[PDB]
Design a binder for these strands. Sequence first.
DNA 1: CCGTTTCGCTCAAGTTAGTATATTAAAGCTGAACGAGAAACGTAAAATGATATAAATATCAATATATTAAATTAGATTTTGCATAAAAAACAGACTACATAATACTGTAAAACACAACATATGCAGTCACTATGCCGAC
Length: 96
Amino acid sequence: ALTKAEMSEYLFDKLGLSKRDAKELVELFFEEIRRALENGEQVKLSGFGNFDLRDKNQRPGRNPKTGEDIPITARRVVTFRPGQKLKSRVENASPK
DNA sequence: CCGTTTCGCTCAAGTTAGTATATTAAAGCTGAACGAGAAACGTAAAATGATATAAATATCAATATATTAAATTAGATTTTGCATAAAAAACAGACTACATAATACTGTAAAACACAACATATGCAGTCACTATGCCGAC
């Protein structure tokens, strides 16, 4: 699974950047995104998708195991709407 | 109310009162002509907002249980900063050998011009005409 380690190694042998700046950019990359989502700002990444923020209202829930109905408290979760460009590059994919 | 004469003013020509600099040396000011990189603009193309509805898929609480990416070490090793020193090649420090200019000295033709008797065209020496109104005389 693609992770920080692999991403840093990529920019290393690709852009020719030191492992220091590379490992730092990968962190600041996702960091800046979270700082925009926590503030309430939308993240529109062209050719990749969008990170929306929808405020859900308290709706009825329960205990999947037993079956005790427990109301799910309202909260602001983050969503991800994959663009049409990325989708087309994942349509004929194959789990590996 | 008006006119006439004195007085406040400025122009014009004498009679006095006051202060004193030139080159070096090195800048400093400012009108005008000279020479690139980065971002705001803009038309055009690509991705996305627009739009809605029954059916399909994701939304998620509360907890047991197998799975796994990956920071956290912890020991292994290429990688990296830094000289040390000798084999090997560069290159002044010598020197005779060799071909080459500045110079030493003899050998010979000829440039460059005074000196002197003639030869004679040409400029200078001496006099009259060419070319056209003065001066003098009348109108």
